[PDB]
């Protein structure tokens with residue numbers, strides 16, 4: 218019996234990534250899709266199946282929904298996640314899970330009281346390429362890790378939560394994935410467009426307590442980049458398309474050390490399918506990994522520490 222999934226919000230990420238995953242995944246059945254405009258829901262249901270629903274409360278009321286996918290804008294996550302959990306639905310929430318750490322802790326407490334799964338949908342964590350990179354780093358391919366950089370920048374597109382919340386979250390999450398649980402804020406700059414009043418870009422510096430640093434760049438006034446890079450005591454490793462590799466795209470790991478470089482081609486994987494599968498498997502089994510929520514909470518704290526500690530610059 219697949220878990221029956223309802224979607225609140227006919228989002229770009231839903232149309233492009235999450236819904237094709239849900240539709241294909243045997244463990245999940247799209248039963249309803251809701252929108253502020255019925256016609257938009259109906260267009261989504263014509264594409265992916267399920268019943269179109271006007272407005273979000275009506276979807277939360279359905280007996281044929283077991284879990285709700287929430288690809289709303291960041292600032293609206295907390296209200297709708299809170300309501301979906303109170304209606305008894307497990308929830309797959311897009312990143313960033315919510316807008317700060319205290320709010321994230323309130324949402325997990327509500328889920329906890331009900332035995333429900335709340336998962337942050339960082340689908341990139343489900344791509345095997347990062348564990349293959351981390352195993353190479355662990356085998357010493359570039360010696361001891363000294364520093365780390367990651368970047369996710371995209372060209373300006375036609376409100377939103379700003380470049381920090383919707384994009385900078387990725388490189389920040391990669392830093393925690395690779396460098397571990399004790400990352401602390403050191404400094405950052407966020408550039409705010411005075412015109413529309415919105416973060417359009419930034420750069421942050423984090424460090425572990427041993428002094429392994431992370432320089433994270435993000436933004437939406439930029440050419441496409443989507444990469445990370447390790448500097449080690451005897452080498453360096455970098456890779457491109459780290460956050461949004463196609464399903465069919467084969468990663469290429471680049472290593473450089475003294476007088477020798479190598480590139481390794483890895484197998485292609487569907488991280489969108491794999492993330493949806495992990496969510497569905499956790500729901501069906503009742504095994505809700507503790508690491509996922511602890512990682513989301515650490516993540517929310519570092520995102521807060523960056524918003525709060527950043528030098529804010531308004532242009533022009």
Ligand SMILES: NC(=O)c1ccc[n+]([C@@H]2O[C@H](COP(=O)([O-])OP(=O)(O)OC[C@H]3O[C@@H](n4cnc5c(N)ncnc54)[C@H](OP(=O)(O)O)[C@@H]3O)[C@@H](O)[C@H]2O)c1
Nearest residue numbers: 226227228229230252253257288289290291311312313383
């Ligand atoms: N697109 C991406 O690949 C991408 C990239 C990075 C991060 N994200 C994250 O994914 C989530 C959604 O991002 P998105 O890029 O897919 O956004 P999006 O295309 O704007 O989708 C958000 C959906 O939320 C609904 N909504 C409800 N109230 C709204 C309001 N006041 N203003 C705008 N939309 C409202 C709309 O659905 P209805 O009109 O159907 O109600 C809208 O289609 C956010 O947490 C974001 O950080 C997405």
Ligand SMILES: Cc1cn([C@H]2C[C@H](O)[C@@H](COP(=O)(O)OP(=O)(O)Oc3ccccc3)O2)c(=O)[nH]c1=O
Nearest residue numbers: 230233234370371372374383384440441443460461
């Ligand atoms: C390949 C590529 C993409 N984009 C644009 C196209 C798109 O506007 C943006 C991101 O494309 P992608 O990394 O594929 O991410 P998803 O759309 O799956 O998820 C996000 C969408 C928006 C923000 C973050 C993630 O960059 C480019 O401009 N050039 C490129 O080579």
Ligand SMILES: [Cl-]
Nearest residue numbers: 338339340341
């Ligand atoms: Cl992701």
Ligand SMILES: [Cl-]
Nearest residue numbers: 456457469471
């Ligand atoms: Cl390449």
Ligand code: NA
Nearest residue numbers: 524525526527
């Ligand atoms: Na600040």
